[PDB]
Design a binder for this molecule. Sequence first.
Ligand SMILES: Cc1cc2nc3c(=O)[nH]c(=O)nc-3n(C[C@H](O)[C@H](O)[C@H](O)COP(=O)(O)OP(=O)(O)OC[C@H]3O[C@@H](n4cnc5c(N)ncnc54)[C@H](O)[C@@H]3O)c2cc1C
Ligand SMILES: *N(O)c1cc(C(F)(F)F)cc2c(=O)nc(N3CCC4(CC3)OC[C@H](C)O4)sc12
Length: 412
Amino acid sequence: PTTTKRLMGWGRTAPTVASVLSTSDPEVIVRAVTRAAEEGGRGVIARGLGRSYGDNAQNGGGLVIDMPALNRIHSIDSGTRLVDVDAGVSLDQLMKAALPHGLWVPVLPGTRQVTVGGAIGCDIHGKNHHSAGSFGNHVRSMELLTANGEVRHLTPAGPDSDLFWATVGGNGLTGIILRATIEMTPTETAYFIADGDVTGSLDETIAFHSDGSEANYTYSSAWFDAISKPPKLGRAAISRGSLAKLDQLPSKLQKDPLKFWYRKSGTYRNKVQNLTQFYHPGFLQYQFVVPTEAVEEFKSIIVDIQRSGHYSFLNVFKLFGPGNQAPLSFPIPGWNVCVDFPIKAGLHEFVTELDRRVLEFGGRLYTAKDSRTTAETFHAMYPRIDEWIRIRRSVDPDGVFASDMARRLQLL
Ligand SMILES: Cc1cc2nc3c(=O)[nH]c(=O)nc-3n(C[C@H](O)[C@H](O)[C@H](O)COP(=O)(O)OP(=O)(O)OC[C@H]3O[C@@H](n4cnc5c(N)ncnc54)[C@H](O)[C@@H]3O)c2cc1C
Ligand SMILES: *N(O)c1cc(C(F)(F)F)cc2c(=O)nc(N3CCC4(CC3)OC[C@H](C)O4)sc12
C-alpha cells in the first residue's frame, strides 16, 4: 500500500523521499497511474532492484512503484527459446528457472540482481556485447503501461517500433513495463571454455583487441592497471571465452552439465570454467565509452586519470560492438571503461573535466552509473535525444512519468 519512504541509488548519494507502492497485482499499478494522471502531482516512476548507482529509479515527492513484487514467470519454451515474464522478475530468478530447459540469459551484467524491467530500462550490456549486443536486442515483445492507462503491445520491428526503442534505454520515462517476452540463448552447458592473457601496457591492451581476435569469442572483458605510471599504465588481465558444448566438458561434469608447484598467472588456454570462475576474477562509479577510431583520445583519458592522483583499483575494460536502434542506448562501438574512484577532495571537479573530454571525443556516459553530470553535457552526448523527447511526450504529454534524473538531465 502507498507509503512514504526514503529512496537511494546503489551509489548511496542524493537521497529523496517518495510514496512507494508494492504490489503483485498489475491492476493496482494501472489504477495508480490513472489516478496519478487525473490528479497530476510530481509523477510516477518504476523501480527495480535499485542497482543503478544514480537517481533514475527515484522520484522525490512523487510515486515510485516497487516492481520486484511483480515477479511471476509465465512460460519457458525450449523450442521457440522464448520466455514470458513479469517485469519484476530477477535475472538471478530467471537464470535458475531457464537453465534446466537449456536456455541462457542472453545478456548478463556484473550482478544477477536486476529486474527484466531494469534490464530494459537501462538497456544493460555485458561481457558478450560485441557478439550479442545489449539486452534490448533480445526482447521479442513488451507490455507498456502508458500515461493514458493503456497497456501497449510493443515489438522491435512491428507497428509501435518507435515506442519500443524509446522504451529500451528509456529509464522508465515512457511508462511502466509490466511484462516481456525475452528470446533466450540456447546452451548445452552452464560452463565456459576460456582463454586468459596478460599484457604489459595500454598500447598492448589496445593492440590485443585490435587484430580481429575478438570474433573468436562470444564473451570478453579485462581488468586493467589505472595506478602505475607509463609504460606500465593500462596493462591488462584479459578474460575471453564462449559457452561450452557438451563434448568439451570433462566426463565428471557431463553428469550434470547445466549445474548451477604450478605458476599461477593470467595466461591459460581452453580452460573449463563455471559462472563464478569466469565472471568474478564511498566510491564514485564512473563508466564511459569513446568511439573505436578515437584511439589516441581514449589513451589520453586513461593517462590523465593516472596523472590526476585519483586511484582506482577496480577497473573493467571492454571493446563494445555495434549499437542498436534505441536513441538513449549507452553502448556504441568502441572503448568502454568502468572505474571506481574513492571519494576525495577534487574528485567532482575532475569527473566534470572527464565528462567534457568524453563529450569532445564522441563518447557518452551511462545512465545506470551517473548522478553528477549536467543536462547540456548529457544531451550533447546523445545526438538523437530530441527525437527521443518528442516520442516520450507523444505518449506522456502532461509528464505523468518523471524521476530525479529526468528533472536533472531535462528529459521531460
Ligand atoms: C555490482 C554491479 C554490477 C553491474 N554491472 C553492470 C554491467 O556489467 N552492465 C550493465 O549494463 N550494467 C551493470 N550494472 C547496472 C545495472 O545492471 C543497471 O543499473 C540496471 O538498470 C539495474 O536494474 P534494476 O532492476 O536495479 O533497476 P533500477 O536500478 O531499479 O532502475 C533502473 C531504471 O530502469 C527503470 N525501470 C526499472 N523497472 C522498470 C519497469 N518494470 N518498467 C519500466 N521501467 C523500469 C527505472 O525507471 C530506472 O530508470 C551493475 C550494477 C551493479 C550494482
Ligand atoms: N563496468 O561496471 C563493467 C563493465 C562490464 C563490461 F560488460 F562492459 F565489460 C562488465 C562488468 C562486470 O562484469 N562486472 C562488474 N562488477 C562490479 C564490481 C563487482 C564485480 C562485478 O565487485 C563486487 C561487486 C558486487 O561487483 S562492473 C562491469
